[PDB]
Design a protein around this nucleic acid. Structure first.
Lengths: 327, 205, 113, 286, 205, 205, 109
RNA sequence: GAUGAUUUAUAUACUUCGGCAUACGU
RNA sequence: ACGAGAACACGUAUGCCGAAGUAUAUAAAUCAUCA
């Protein structure tokens, strides 16, 4: 039984599917007066620095650090060489919008792009999220024959004007802004892909119910605990925590949360899942969880969101509305 | 006896990945490479994979042993029947048009999709570098069909139409359930190489 | 074969190369990985000048991490990376670049072990 | 007195009765026929062959040591040179004979199967006719040798004839890759010593019979082996059609005679264009 | 009595694979190697393979029992109806050009592309290794044709031309229906090595 | 009267198979062994095979019911002709250089070519094994020509080289039509070993 | 030569898997094929580089998890792969490949 | 007020299977 | 005046048929460091 579906994902919160290309401070120029970042191609930059023999001073600009060995961005060198901005188009690849939460940019994670340097939602990522919802509903990951039938296609290419950059914000006690800026698809964007189900093993109504129950447990067990932390109240009042219970909500991409990608807070009670996940994160991350003597009100401690200053609003990283239409 | 060519071009909609050979598994580099060629190291699509996918699709469309409708078109190696495979599906070669277009646009022939697998009990993930041929890549196939029986060809091609059409509504290569290998077939000219068969009325979509 | 002794000579109870963590090593090596993929893409032994430019930009990455982190600096020093990069640019032969890539991945091979 | 040594670069087809069987030696009549035919090719004089030449059967050698046919005075076929000083007197153990039989192997008999396609040359729809040739492929540095007697001028004559012979070939199937050899002249003091012995008996070394007047007083006090010798006249001009040789019986090599006989060159041909000279001059090494 | 010599090169489009013998008991390498020479240990294309393939395609082009033209070109063993094989095929070895062309830029002589056979009940995958010569390899074919009786030779060559076409439209070797063994003939010159037959007008392509 | 030794060497251009029959008759073993020494085991070419092939080729050249040249060179033992062959083809053996070269780089003296025969009624396939000599093997030919008449050599060798020429453009051994048994002549050194005939003005190749 | 070590260790090298062994076997299979490509006993400097890369991969796979580390330590894989280069002969390399293959086959049982 | 820093780098499977294993002519 | 001479172990024959490098798999987790 072959059935094809148009699935529309509406980004209620920014989503970033990374690639491991954590590009450092020396591969972009942030215009603090334009709220824009210019991303350059390394070949063009090095060819430029060789054309007028600026590579020689580049090498001793990098090593033998100019005062602070970590704040030495791309802007400091061009300031030293007095190279103006209006001539940067010969080596800049593309420019995008930046949304801080604090001032320069620390590091810019590059989201997934194909060979044509276009933006798409991976089929594997959203299929993994949908399967996370389904396994939350049933807890059957061993079954490898069920999901051989559910085919998810890669999304269509995304226009460059629809993509921005958001700073990682970790709401633990206040609206703390982390030194991680990730390239995210902007909010209020409809992205269409295909969700084919073979042999009718999973029906649309029951997968939608699985998604809704996943988010119901997600809200009731972990999220609500942030309405008492002062930073959580500030985040919710800014619009980062909408009352979207009993609704088709998925979490996609990086920085959405440990709970948003683990069925752990679904197959167990809130308290038991809390202690077990605290033990898990204590085992994994000794940097923070190893220094916590007592279990906090939440296991992932800080909720992962971001803010946009163009509207003075906040979102949380991960929310997307999923809608199905048979064809 | 006669024999005809179906000369078409498959454009990759979502990156297509077919596993390679012994390659050179570098520590931080690609783990499962695309098969590629060797005279020019360009990506290719083996005709064996195309034939396997087409035969499986046609069988599932008909059979739900062997299926005689599938046997007539993809060989029937068994004790008693033995009929030659009507379709000699060929390997799909990286077209020169895609080469020149990707060279004139600074677009890599193949992507590199850094995938993952969360294992959602500790969310530990697994880096798993993988690549696939870039979308818009064109591979030329020269499918060869054998006219064993004169008064069957149309019927065979009817199945071929489905075996082609439902293939365009289906993936190819590895990991196709996760948006890999979605392809479309274009410029699928049909011409006769051997014999004096009339293939003008034939059409593949 | 140079990498085995240099890794075994600055590993003790732990610490590796005065603080070079695995994550920093793979951050250094991601550029080498992408250049290795490009080199395997090319069928010509002679390196295209664009690839030479990207090689000097890999050297610029190396200088940046050296000037930002000390442990990376003596990892690049005691393993004599920069002179080998210079030989790779001068030689203009793909096989030498592949040899350098194998030598570099030897570092992480012994670092894990 | 001289000894001729032969190393064969190809297998040989020394037959006995058919193309399917091949022996390891050719008796003195075959060797004499070869020498005669070669003298006829060279256009030399053949009187020394018919009146002054004594030759013996071909005997094997295993790369250093020579053999001679077993005197009839069990499983031995060729006794080495350095054992006649004890065997005739009767001091060779049966274990020694078995050991020699186990060790002695100058070559291997190969029944090579061939086809004739003459019928297919004209009748292209006909079929091949297969046959078998039994050849004897010699071990390397292993081969044949024989003892030839005569004057120095007769020996020089024979040396020239055999210089032609080594490229002429020996035995059957000479034009078909068999029988070609190369010869050398070397002296073994043992061969001379056995050639210079004396005794009441007389061991024979070349297939022989007496004249019609000497036959009676030759058989007295004798134990020997007598063989049928036949074949076909290998001659272009003997007759229009191939003619079988008149059957001739001869004393095989290794016989024992109380009183020696001079032997003869018997004309065993019919009223053909030329005679056929069956050699029966016995060489005695008692 | 002349002897025409059809000398030229055959180029591989899709990796040609003519299987070998029992080789060894290898447990994950060379699951099915290609037939190779021994003096140079180079891939070889045995003339028996060409003769058998051309025999099959010519007899199924004429007959679709032993067809007369096919019998006269290739051989007619029979109880009483044997006529000689007038076309002695020959083995194919790497050209002088290709042997150094593939070495001056480090191009492999053979491929080792992987394969599957999965299943239709459990999908057990069950892989497979096939060794095929790299595409673009040139093999020297030195076919020899005996001029038995003059006044049909041209026609016979016409027939071989047709057979050549079928080789140019079909496969040579194992797995050729799954995109393998595709070749073309080129650099073909017709000359009488021995004899006085005027084969200048003869053309093969 | 004199003798002329035509020594020299013959190089195996491609696998040469001369059947022997009684070497192996087991299941899965070689179904067609070459003729070899019983104990030495080195593959050889019998002089009878070369003699027959040369006689057949010369008869084909001359006839197109006998021509006196061939019978003079090879023998005419008929009812009314009975001649002695002027030429004595000898058995061909491995040149010691070929032996040591093959022993150095571990090149086997013989190949074990595998074949099929299939069927036009069922296409069931059927295996076959044929032993051949390794390509590039080199043998020595010691053809001795006895000069029966003086004013014939300046003709006979012209025929002989013709029989050589036809032999270097035609197979030698079994199954040569399916490419096999192709040989070439080289290193020919015509000499006069017996007599005073001038062998310095004769050519064979 | 390889049966005793495989069958001496439910218990088989603690936690070894078929996939790990075949991942190891892929590189030596490629080296075996590329050696059969060459017609000379002496291995080229390129082959030496591939052997060094094989050691690099072997050490990495030993490092990243304990199962293959114990497997390699028990089977004397590193000394034999070093001896392969030290002896520098194609036949010894083929013998090493056959030893690795026998290890894998006995692991199948 | 600045800054990112660690952890996994592919894991688990299948590793060829089924068929013909030479026939017919002297 | 060689149990010899004349005599291709030769002719026909595809290592070929069927089989997907495939199945499963979110580039993700952590939120802290320094003045």
């Amino acid at each position: 039984t072959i059935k094809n579906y148009e699935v529309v994902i509406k980004t209620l919160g920014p989503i970033h599917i990374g690639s491991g290309q954590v590009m450092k401070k020396q591969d972009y120029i942030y215009d603090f007066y334009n709220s824009k970042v210019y991303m350059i191609n390394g070949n063009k930059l090095v060819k430029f620095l060789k054309r007028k023999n600026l590579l020689y001073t580049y090498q001793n600009f990098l090593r033998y650090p100019p005062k602070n060995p970590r704040e030495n961005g791309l802007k400091d060198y061009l300031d030293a060489q007095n190279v103006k901005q209006s001539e940067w188009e010969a080596f800049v690849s593309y420019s995008e919008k930046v949304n801080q939460g604090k001032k320069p940019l620390n590091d810019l994670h590059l989201m997934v792009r194909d060979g044509q340097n276009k933006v798409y939602l991976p089929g594997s990522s959203i299929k993994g999220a949908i399967k996370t919802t389904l396994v939350s509903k049933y807890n059957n990951e061993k079954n490898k024959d069920i999901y051989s039938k559910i085919k998810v296609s890669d999304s269509k290419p995304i226009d460059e004007s629809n993509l921005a950059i958001y700073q990682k914000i970790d709401i633990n006690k206040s609206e703390k802004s982390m030194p991680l800026y990730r390239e995210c698809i902007d909010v209020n964007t409809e992205i269409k892909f295909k969700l084919t189900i073979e042999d009718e093993i999973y029906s649309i109504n029951e997968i939608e119910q699985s998604i809704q129950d996943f988010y119901k447990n997600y809200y009731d067990k972990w999220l609500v605990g942030f309405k008492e932390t002062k930073g959580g109240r500030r985040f919710a009042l800014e619009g980062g925590i909408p009352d979207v219970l009993n609704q088709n909500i998925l979490f996609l991409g990086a920085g959405t949360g440990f709970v948003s990608k683990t069925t752990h807070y679904q197959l167990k009670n809130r308290k038991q899942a809390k202690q077990d996940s605290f033990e898990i994160l204590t085992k994994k991350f000794r940097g923070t969880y190893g220094k916590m003597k007592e279990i906090p009100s939440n296991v992932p401690v800080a909720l992962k969101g971001t803010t946009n200053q163009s509207r003075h609003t906040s979102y949380q990283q991960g929310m997307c509305k999923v809608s199905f239409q048979e064809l | 006896y006669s024999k005809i060519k179906i000369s078409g071009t498959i454009e990759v909609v979502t990156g297509l990945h077919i596993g390679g050979g012994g390659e050179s598994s570098m520590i931080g580099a690609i783990d499962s490479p695309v098969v590629r060629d060797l005279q020019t190291k360009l990506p290719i699509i083996p005709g064996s994979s195309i034939k396997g996918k087409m035969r499986n699709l046609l069988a599932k469309h008909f059979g739900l042993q062997d299926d005689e409708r599938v046997l007539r078109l993809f060989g029937s190696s068994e004790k008693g029947n033995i009929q030659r495979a009507r379709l000699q599906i060929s390997d799909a070669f990286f077209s020169e048009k895609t080469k020149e277009h990707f060279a004139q646009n600074d677009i890599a022939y193949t992507e590199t999709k850094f995938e993952n697998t969360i294992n959602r009990l500790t969310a530990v993930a697994n880096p798993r570098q993988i690549e696939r041929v870039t979308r818009g890549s064109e591979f030329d196939f020269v499918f060869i069909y054998n006219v064993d029986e004169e008064s069957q060809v149309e019927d065979d091609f009817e199945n071929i139409e489905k075996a082609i059409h439902l293939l365009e509504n289906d993936y190819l290569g590895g990991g196709g359930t996760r948006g890999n290998g979605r392809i479309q077939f274009k410029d699928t000219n049909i011409e006769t190489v051997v014999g004096e068969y009339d293939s003008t009325n034939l059409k593949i979509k | 074969t140079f990498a085995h002794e240099v890794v075994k000579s600055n590993v003790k109870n732990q610490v590796l190369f005065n603080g070079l963590t695995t994550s920093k090593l793979r951050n250094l090596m991601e550029q080498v990985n992408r250049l290795y993929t490009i080199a395997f893409n090319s069928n010509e032994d002679q390196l295209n000048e664009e690839f030479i430019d990207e090689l000097e930009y890999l050297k610029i990455k190396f200088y940046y991490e050296a000037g930002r982190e000390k442990s990376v600096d003596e990892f690049l020093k005691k393993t004599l990376m920069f002179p080998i990069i210079d030989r790779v640019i001068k030689k203009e032969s793909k096989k030498f670049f592949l040899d350098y890539c194998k030598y570099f991945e030897a570092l992480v091979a012994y670092a894990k072990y | 007195t001289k000894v001729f040594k032969l190393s064969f670069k190809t297998p040989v087809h020394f037959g006995k009765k058919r193309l399917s069987d091949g022996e390891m030696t050719i008796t003195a009549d075959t060797l004499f026929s070869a020498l005669f035919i070669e003298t006829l090719q060279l256009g030399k004089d053949t009187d020394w062959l018919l009146n002054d030449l004594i030759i013996s059967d071909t005997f094997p050698y295993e790369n250093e040591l020579y053999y001679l046919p077993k005197p009839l005075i069990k499983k031995l076929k060729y006794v080495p040179v350095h054992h006649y000083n004890q065997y005739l007197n009767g001091e060779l153990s049966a274990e020694d004979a078995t050991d020699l039989n186990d060790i002695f192997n100058i070559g291997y008999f190969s029944l090579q199967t061939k086809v004739s396609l003459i019928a297919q040359e004209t009748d292209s729809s006909a079929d091949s006719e297969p046959y078998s040739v039994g050849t004897f492929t010699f071990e390397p540095e292993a081969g044949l040798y024989f003892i030839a007697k005569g004057s120095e001028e007769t020996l020089d004559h024979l040396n020239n004839i055999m210089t032609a012979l080594q490229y002429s070939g020996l035995g059957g199937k000479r034009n078909a890759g068999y029988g070609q050899f190369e010869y050398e002249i070397i002296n073994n003091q043992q061969l001379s010593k056995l050639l210079n012995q004396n005794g009441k008996h007389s061991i024979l070394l070349s297939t022989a019979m007496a004249k019609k007047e000497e036959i009676e007083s030759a058989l007295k006090e004798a134990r020997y082996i007598l063989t049928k010798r036949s074949g076909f006249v290998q001659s272009t001009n003997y007759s229009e059609m191939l003619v079988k040789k008149s059957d001739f019986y001869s004393f095989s090599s290794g016989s024992v005679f109380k009183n020696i006989f001079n032997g003869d060159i018997f004309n065993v041909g019919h009223n053909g264009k030329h005679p056929v000279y069956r050699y029966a001059k016995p060489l005695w090494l008692e």
